[PDB]
A paper describes a structure:
SaPIs are clinically relevant pathogenicity islands, residing passively in the host chromosome under control of the SaPI master repressor, Stl. Some Staphylococcus aureus phages encode dimeric instead of trimeric Duts, which are completely unrelated at both sequence and structural levels. The crystal structure of the ϕDI Dut described here represents the first structural characterization of this group of dimeric Duts, revealing particular features. Remarkably for unrelated proteins, our results indicate the de-repression mechanism used by dimeric and trimeric Duts is conceptually identical, involving dUTP as a second messenger turning off Stl-Dut interaction.
To validate this idea, we obtained the three-dimensional structure of ϕDI Dut in apo form, allowing us to compare this with the dUPNPP bound structure. The apo ϕDI structure showed a dimeric organization that, surprisingly, presents a “closed” conformation almost identical to the dUPNPP-bound form. This was confirmed by the minimal differences observed when both dimers were superimposed (RMSD of 0.36 Å). The major differences are observed at the C-terminal helix α8, where electron density is poorly defined for the apo structure’s last fourteen residues, indicating that the region is highly flexible. Similarly, the last five residues of helix α8 of the dUPNPP-bound structure present poor density, confirming the high intrinsic mobility of this region. These minimal changes could represent the transition between “open” and “closed” conformations in phagic dimeric Duts. Although to a lesser extent, the nucleotide seems to stabilize the C-terminal helix of the phagic dimeric Duts, similarly to the dUTP-induced ordering of C-terminal motif V in the trimeric Duts. Oppositely, the binding of the nucleotide seems to have minimal conformational effect in the ϕDI Dut, which presents a “closed” conformation in its apo state. Therefore, the absence of the major part of the mobile C-terminal portion, which also provides several phosphate interacting residues, would explain the fixed closed conformation observed for the ϕDI Dut.
Numbering used by the authors:
A (entry chain A): 2 to 156
B (entry chain D): 2 to 159
Write the structure that this text describes.
């Protein structure tokens, strides 16, 4: 129904934790950088700046597979910083409140400047990274489509 | 074979011009976004943040082909704004002056944050965009390898 429950979120955090447990070299600095790199890879699949293309936008399954990479690093960063009940409650409060990240904006190629703006601020929260990826799923795709692409990626 | 001459630069601007002349929808705003997206595509090929891979890094030819995309949009942005002898001289002056962009710096995955801080600056210049890509070529690769990858790219694009 295009909603995210705390149960779903905790399940996703558990799947990432099990994946990341197999990486003894895991570190927050690298994971935060990968999130930004994967964001740009996803943004590139939208092709909203590619005026030279007749039919802009990669296939939906390709856009979703790239969105799922962002989700993976967002979940990982949240696990690595610690993501407990306190953090979930903040996430859902922010997520329900958030109205800036809607369909037309995300379609506007200029949004990438607002994202970079957030990404080089060292104080960006694990909450914010997850709000962004789920809002993109909720407004441009569905949450279920993203969760499906993520689970496929992880198995 | 790791130097850039004004003859070489004028030649690259002319190649980009001939390509872009064939794109009736060309616009500067989209080209400035494309430069940044392609910068990140190239940075992803280094894999310097991928501690979970044993031997990180895409093939050298893949790295150079992505570096050449950055060069293409930097040349395009320069051409679209107007880039005359006056600007070429300022470019070479900057390029020669540039000493922050060295092998150790580019090596460091944290460098992307410094790049982002330039990319989100509305006042980022066309000269600076070209200094960045040619310095990356000079320091991590060679300028000649970048030019060669770019010229091939532009022949496959027509």
């Amino acid at each position: 129904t295009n909603t995210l429950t705390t149960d779903q979120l905790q399940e996703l955090l558990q799947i990432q934790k099990e994946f990341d447990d197999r990486i003894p070299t895991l570190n927050l600095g690298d994971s935060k950088i990968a999130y930004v790199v994967e964001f740009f890879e996803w943004f590139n699949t939208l092709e909203t700046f590619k005026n030279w293309k007749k039919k802009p936008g990669k296939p939906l399954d390709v856009q979703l597979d790239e969105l799922a990479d962002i989700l993976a690093f967002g979940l990982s960063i949240a696990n690595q910083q610690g993501f407990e009940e306190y953090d979930r409650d903040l996430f859902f409060e922010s997520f329900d409140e958030e109205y800036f990240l809607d369909f037309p904006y995300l379609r506007n190629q200029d949004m990438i400047y607002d994202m970079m703006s957030e990404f080089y601020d060292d104080d960006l929260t694990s909450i914010r990274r997850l709000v962004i990826v789920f809002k993109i799923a909720e407004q441009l795709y569905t949450i279920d489509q993203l969760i499906d692409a993520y689970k496929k990626k992880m198995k």
